[PDB]
Amino acid sequence: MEKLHEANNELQKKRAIIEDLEPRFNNSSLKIEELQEALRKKEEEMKQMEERYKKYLEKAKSVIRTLDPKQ
Amino acid sequence: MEKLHEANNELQKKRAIIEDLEPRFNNSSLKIEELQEALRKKEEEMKQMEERYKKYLEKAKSVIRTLDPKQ
Amino acid sequence: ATMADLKMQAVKEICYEVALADFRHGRAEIEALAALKMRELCRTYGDAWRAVARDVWDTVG
Amino acid sequence: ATMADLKMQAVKEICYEVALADFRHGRAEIEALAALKMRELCRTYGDAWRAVARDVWDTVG
Protein backbone atom coordinates (compact mmCIF):
# COMPACT_ATOMS: atom_id res chain seq x y z
CA MET A 1 0.00 0.00 0.00
CA GLU A 2 3.01 2.21 0.33
CA LYS A 3 3.25 1.70 -3.42
CA LEU A 4 -0.54 2.04 -3.87
CA HIS A 5 -0.97 5.36 -2.08
CA GLU A 6 1.98 6.33 -4.32
CA ALA A 7 0.69 5.28 -7.73
CA ASN A 8 -2.69 6.63 -6.71
CA ASN A 9 -1.07 9.96 -5.82
CA GLU A 10 0.50 9.99 -9.27
CA LEU A 11 -2.85 8.95 -10.76
CA GLN A 12 -4.69 11.91 -9.23
CA LYS A 13 -2.02 14.23 -10.63
CA LYS A 14 -2.19 12.91 -14.19
CA ARG A 15 -5.93 13.26 -14.81
CA ALA A 16 -5.85 16.78 -13.43
CA ILE A 17 -3.40 17.32 -16.36
CA ILE A 18 -5.55 15.75 -19.08
CA GLU A 19 -8.58 17.63 -17.77
CA ASP A 20 -6.42 20.76 -18.24
CA LEU A 21 -5.12 19.85 -21.73
CA GLU A 22 -8.00 18.18 -23.49
CA PRO A 23 -9.95 21.51 -23.63
CA ARG A 24 -6.77 23.51 -24.30
CA PHE A 25 -6.44 21.28 -27.37
CA ASN A 26 -10.09 20.80 -28.28
CA ASN A 27 -10.78 24.52 -28.64
CA SER A 28 -7.53 24.63 -30.63
CA SER A 29 -8.72 22.19 -33.30
CA LEU A 30 -11.49 24.80 -33.46
CA LYS A 31 -9.16 27.79 -33.94
CA ILE A 32 -7.40 25.92 -36.76
CA GLU A 33 -10.76 25.78 -38.57
CA GLU A 34 -11.74 29.39 -37.79
CA LEU A 35 -8.45 30.68 -39.19
CA GLN A 36 -8.71 28.41 -42.23
CA GLU A 37 -12.23 29.69 -42.96
CA ALA A 38 -11.10 33.31 -42.55
CA LEU A 39 -8.09 32.70 -44.77
CA ARG A 40 -10.31 31.32 -47.56
CA LYS A 41 -12.79 34.19 -47.20
CA LYS A 42 -9.98 36.75 -47.42
CA GLU A 43 -8.41 34.91 -50.33
CA GLU A 44 -11.80 35.28 -52.03
CA GLU A 45 -12.45 38.97 -51.27
CA MET A 46 -9.09 39.79 -52.79
CA LYS A 47 -9.73 37.65 -55.85
CA GLN A 48 -12.87 39.72 -56.44
CA MET A 49 -11.58 43.09 -55.32
CA GLU A 50 -8.84 42.62 -57.91
CA GLU A 51 -11.25 41.56 -60.67
CA ARG A 52 -13.43 44.57 -59.73
CA TYR A 53 -10.37 46.82 -60.05
CA LYS A 54 -9.23 45.35 -63.36
CA LYS A 55 -12.66 45.93 -64.87
CA TYR A 56 -13.05 49.58 -63.91
CA LEU A 57 -9.55 49.96 -65.41
CA GLU A 58 -10.80 48.68 -68.78
CA LYS A 59 -13.95 50.79 -68.43
CA ALA A 60 -11.66 53.78 -67.96
CA LYS A 61 -9.54 53.08 -71.04
CA SER A 62 -12.65 52.61 -73.13
CA VAL A 63 -14.06 55.95 -72.07
CA ILE A 64 -10.54 57.24 -72.69
CA ARG A 65 -10.56 55.64 -76.14
CA THR A 66 -13.85 57.33 -77.04
CA LEU A 67 -12.49 60.67 -75.84
CA ASP A 68 -9.65 60.49 -78.34
CA PRO A 69 -8.76 64.14 -78.98
CA LYS A 70 -7.41 63.46 -82.47
CA GLN A 71 -10.91 62.35 -83.54
CA MET B 1 -2.27 -5.61 -4.37
CA GLU B 2 -4.68 -6.37 -7.17
CA LYS B 3 -5.29 -2.60 -7.07
CA LEU B 4 -1.50 -2.31 -7.28
CA HIS B 5 -1.23 -3.86 -10.75
CA GLU B 6 -4.61 -2.39 -11.70
CA ALA B 7 -3.27 1.05 -10.67
CA ASN B 8 0.02 0.54 -12.52
CA ASN B 9 -1.94 -0.41 -15.63
CA GLU B 10 -4.13 2.70 -15.37
CA LEU B 11 -1.01 4.72 -14.57
CA GLN B 12 0.74 3.81 -17.81
CA LYS B 13 -2.39 4.23 -19.87
CA LYS B 14 -2.91 7.77 -18.58
CA ARG B 15 0.66 8.83 -19.29
CA ALA B 16 0.42 7.44 -22.83
CA ILE B 17 -2.33 10.04 -23.18
CA ILE B 18 -0.37 13.01 -21.80
CA GLU B 19 2.58 11.82 -23.88
CA ASP B 20 0.25 11.95 -26.88
CA LEU B 21 -1.44 15.30 -26.08
CA GLU B 22 1.58 17.51 -25.29
CA PRO B 23 3.06 17.35 -28.85
CA ARG B 24 -0.35 17.31 -30.52
CA PHE B 25 -1.14 20.60 -28.79
CA ASN B 26 2.38 22.00 -29.18
CA ASN B 27 2.23 21.53 -32.95
CA SER B 28 -1.21 23.11 -33.26
CA SER B 29 0.01 26.09 -31.21
CA LEU B 30 2.36 26.43 -34.17
CA LYS B 31 -0.48 26.00 -36.67
CA ILE B 32 -2.73 28.67 -35.13
CA GLU B 33 0.11 31.20 -35.03
CA GLU B 34 1.18 30.05 -38.49
CA LEU B 35 -2.36 30.64 -39.75
CA GLN B 36 -2.48 33.91 -37.84
CA GLU B 37 0.55 35.39 -39.59
CA ALA B 38 -0.66 34.49 -43.06
CA LEU B 39 -3.83 36.50 -42.34
CA ARG B 40 -1.79 39.58 -41.52
CA LYS B 41 0.38 38.93 -44.54
CA LYS B 42 -2.70 38.48 -46.73
CA GLU B 43 -4.29 41.69 -45.42
CA GLU B 44 -1.10 43.43 -46.51
CA GLU B 45 -1.45 41.97 -50.01
CA MET B 46 -4.82 43.69 -50.28
CA LYS B 47 -3.51 47.03 -49.11
CA GLN B 48 -0.66 47.08 -51.63
CA MET B 49 -2.89 45.86 -54.48
CA GLU B 50 -5.87 48.04 -53.71
CA GLU B 51 -3.46 50.91 -53.27
CA ARG B 52 -1.86 50.02 -56.60
CA TYR B 53 -5.14 50.21 -58.52
CA LYS B 54 -6.35 53.34 -56.69
CA LYS B 55 -3.22 55.08 -58.01
CA TYR B 56 -3.74 54.45 -61.71
CA LEU B 57 -7.49 54.99 -61.56
CA GLU B 58 -6.92 58.54 -60.39
CA LYS B 59 -4.48 59.04 -63.24
CA ALA B 60 -7.14 57.53 -65.50
CA LYS B 61 -9.78 59.83 -64.00
CA SER B 62 -7.33 62.68 -64.35
CA VAL B 63 -6.78 61.82 -68.02
CA ILE B 64 -10.51 61.57 -68.47
CA ARG B 65 -10.99 65.02 -66.88
CA THR B 66 -8.44 66.54 -69.23
CA LEU B 67 -10.26 65.32 -72.41
CA ASP B 68 -13.54 66.83 -71.21
CA PRO B 69 -15.68 66.64 -74.39
CA LYS B 70 -17.47 69.97 -73.77
CA GLN B 71 -14.19 71.82 -74.65
CA ALA C 1 -24.14 69.83 -87.07
CA THR C 2 -26.06 66.78 -88.32
CA MET C 3 -27.64 64.08 -86.19
CA ALA C 4 -24.53 61.86 -86.04
CA ASP C 5 -22.81 64.97 -84.65
CA LEU C 6 -25.44 65.23 -81.90
CA LYS C 7 -25.41 61.49 -81.09
CA MET C 8 -21.60 61.18 -81.13
CA GLN C 9 -21.34 64.20 -78.84
CA ALA C 10 -24.06 62.76 -76.59
CA VAL C 11 -22.11 59.49 -76.21
CA LYS C 12 -18.80 61.28 -75.56
CA GLU C 13 -20.45 63.39 -72.86
CA ILE C 14 -22.39 60.61 -71.21
CA CYS C 15 -19.28 58.42 -71.24
CA TYR C 16 -17.74 61.31 -69.23
CA GLU C 17 -20.58 61.76 -66.70
CA VAL C 18 -20.68 57.95 -66.37
CA ALA C 19 -16.92 57.94 -65.78
CA LEU C 20 -16.37 60.74 -63.29
CA ALA C 21 -19.37 59.43 -61.30
CA ASP C 22 -17.10 56.38 -60.68
CA PHE C 23 -19.20 54.15 -63.02
CA ARG C 24 -22.25 54.26 -60.70
CA HIS C 25 -24.60 54.36 -63.71
CA GLY C 26 -26.44 51.33 -65.03
CA ARG C 27 -28.44 50.69 -68.17
CA ALA C 28 -31.83 52.27 -67.43
CA GLU C 29 -29.98 55.06 -65.62
CA ILE C 30 -28.02 55.42 -68.89
CA GLU C 31 -30.94 54.91 -71.31
CA ALA C 32 -32.52 58.02 -69.75
CA LEU C 33 -29.42 60.28 -69.81
CA ALA C 34 -29.33 59.97 -73.61
CA ALA C 35 -32.90 61.17 -74.12
CA LEU C 36 -31.90 64.07 -71.89
CA LYS C 37 -28.75 64.67 -73.95
CA MET C 38 -30.33 64.13 -77.37
CA ARG C 39 -33.36 66.29 -76.63
CA GLU C 40 -31.19 69.11 -75.23
CA LEU C 41 -29.03 68.92 -78.38
CA CYS C 42 -31.99 69.32 -80.76
CA ARG C 43 -33.00 72.28 -78.54
CA THR C 44 -29.56 73.93 -78.68
CA TYR C 45 -29.01 73.00 -82.37
CA GLY C 46 -36.20 61.26 -82.04
CA ASP C 47 -35.25 57.65 -81.42
CA ALA C 48 -31.55 58.58 -81.56
CA TRP C 49 -31.25 58.10 -77.80
CA ARG C 50 -31.70 54.33 -78.26
CA ALA C 51 -28.54 54.00 -80.37
CA VAL C 52 -26.67 56.46 -78.14
CA ALA C 53 -27.31 54.40 -74.98
CA ARG C 54 -26.28 51.24 -76.83
CA ASP C 55 -23.03 52.90 -77.89
CA VAL C 56 -22.50 54.11 -74.31
CA TRP C 57 -23.32 50.82 -72.60
CA ASP C 58 -21.13 48.91 -75.11
CA THR C 59 -18.23 50.95 -73.73
CA VAL C 60 -19.19 51.11 -70.01
CA GLY C 61 -21.12 47.88 -69.50
CA ALA D 1 -4.35 78.49 -84.39
CA THR D 2 -3.17 80.34 -81.28
CA MET D 3 -0.21 78.64 -79.65
CA ALA D 4 -2.22 78.37 -76.41
CA ASP D 5 -4.36 75.74 -78.16
CA LEU D 6 -1.58 74.11 -80.15
CA LYS D 7 -0.07 73.56 -76.72
CA MET D 8 -3.46 72.51 -75.31
CA GLN D 9 -3.76 69.97 -78.10
CA ALA D 10 -0.32 68.48 -77.46
CA VAL D 11 -1.24 68.32 -73.79
CA LYS D 12 -4.41 66.33 -74.60
CA GLU D 13 -2.66 64.17 -77.18
CA ILE D 14 0.10 63.23 -74.73
CA CYS D 15 -2.19 62.44 -71.79
CA TYR D 16 -4.32 60.12 -73.97
CA GLU D 17 -1.20 58.25 -75.12
CA VAL D 18 0.34 57.78 -71.63
CA ALA D 19 -2.96 56.49 -70.24
CA LEU D 20 -3.46 53.95 -73.02
CA ALA D 21 0.12 52.88 -72.38
CA ASP D 22 -0.91 52.30 -68.71
CA PHE D 23 0.93 55.34 -67.36
CA ARG D 24 4.17 53.62 -68.38
CA HIS D 25 5.80 56.95 -69.27
CA GLY D 26 8.01 58.94 -66.88
CA ARG D 27 8.97 62.63 -67.02
CA ALA D 28 11.96 62.61 -69.39
CA GLU D 29 9.82 60.47 -71.68
CA ILE D 30 7.04 63.06 -71.39
CA GLU D 31 9.35 66.04 -71.99
CA ALA D 32 10.62 64.34 -75.13
CA LEU D 33 7.10 63.45 -76.18
CA ALA D 34 6.19 67.09 -75.59
CA ALA D 35 8.81 68.65 -77.88
CA LEU D 36 8.17 66.12 -80.67
CA LYS D 37 4.44 66.64 -80.32
CA MET D 38 5.15 70.39 -80.39
CA ARG D 39 7.46 70.40 -83.41
CA GLU D 40 5.11 68.20 -85.42
CA LEU D 41 2.13 70.41 -84.52
CA CYS D 42 3.87 73.62 -85.57
CA ARG D 43 4.51 71.80 -88.87
CA THR D 44 0.75 71.18 -89.11
CA TYR D 45 -0.67 74.73 -89.13
CA GLY D 46 10.63 76.21 -78.84
CA ASP D 47 10.05 76.58 -75.10
CA ALA D 48 6.41 75.61 -75.79
CA TRP D 49 7.00 72.02 -74.72
CA ARG D 50 8.13 73.08 -71.22
CA ALA D 51 4.64 74.32 -70.37
CA VAL D 52 3.07 71.42 -72.21
CA ALA D 53 5.11 68.72 -70.44
CA ARG D 54 4.58 70.48 -67.14
CA ASP D 55 0.85 70.48 -67.66
CA VAL D 56 1.17 66.79 -68.55
CA TRP D 57 3.04 65.80 -65.37
CA ASP D 58 0.77 67.98 -63.21
CA THR D 59 -2.09 65.66 -64.34
CA VAL D 60 -0.47 62.19 -64.67
CA GLY D 61 0.87 61.79 -61.13
Residue numbers in the entry:
A (entry chain D), B (entry chain C): 552 to 622
C (entry chain B), D (entry chain A): 742 to 786, 793 to 808
Excerpt from the publication:
Hook microtubule tethering protein 3 (Hook3), a cargo adaptor protein that serves as a crucial scaffold protein linking cargo to microtubule motors, plays a pivotal role in regulating bidirectional early endosome trafficking, managing directional movement, and maintaining Golgi morphology. Among these domains, the Hook domain together with the first and second coiled coils serve as the dynein-binding region, whereas the third coiled coil-containing the carboxyl-terminal region interacts with several proteins, including fused toes homolog (FTS), FTS−Hook−FHIP1B (FHF) complex subunit Hook interacting protein 1B (FHIP1B), and kinesin family member 1 C (KIF1C). KIF1C, a kinesin-3 family member with plus-end-directed motility, mediates the anterograde (plus-end-directed) transport of vesicles containing several components, such as α5β1 integrin, 14-3-3, and protein tyrosine phosphatase non-receptor type 21 (PTPN21). A previous study showed that KIF1C exists as an autoinhibited homodimer, and becomes activated by interacting with the carboxyl-terminal region of Hook3 or the FERM domain of PTPN21.
We verified the direct intermolecular interaction between Hook3 and KIF1C, and revealed their binding modules, which subsequently led to determination of the crystal structure of Hook3(553–624) bound to KIF1C(714–809) in a 2:2 heterotetrameric form. In this complex, residues 553–618 of Hook3, which constitute the parallel coiled coil, consist of two distinct types of heptad repeats. As shown in Fig. EV2B, the coiled-coil conformation of Hook3 is maintained by an elaborate network of hydrophobic interactions. This homodimeric Hook3 coiled-coil acts as a scaffold for complex formation with two KIF1C(714–809) molecules, in which residues 742–786 and 793–807 are visible in our complex crystal structure. KIF1C(714–809) forms an antiparallel three-helical bundle consisting of α1 (residues 744–762), α2 (residues 768–785), and α3 (residues 795–807). The protein folding of KIF1C(714–809) is sustained by intensive intramolecular hydrophobic interactions between the residues constituting the three α-helices, which include Lys748, Val752, Ile755, and Val759 from α1; Phe764 from the α1–α2 loop; Ile771, Ala775, Ala776, and Met779 from α2; Trp796, Val799, Ala800, Val803, Trp804, and Val807 from α3. Our crystal structure revealed several key hydrophobic residues from the α1 helix and the α1–α2 loop of KIF1C that directly contribute to the complex formation, in which each single KIF1C protomer recognizes both molecules of homodimeric Hook3. Specifically, the main Hook3-binding interface of KIF1C is constituted by Lys753, Tyr757, Ala760, and Leu761 from α1; Asp763 and Phe764 from the α1–α2 loop, which are associated with Tyr607, Lys610, Ala611, Val614, and Leu618 of one Hook3 molecule and Lys612, Ile615, Arg616, and Pro620 of another Hook3 protomer that coordinately form a large extended hydrophobic surface on the Hook3 homodimer.
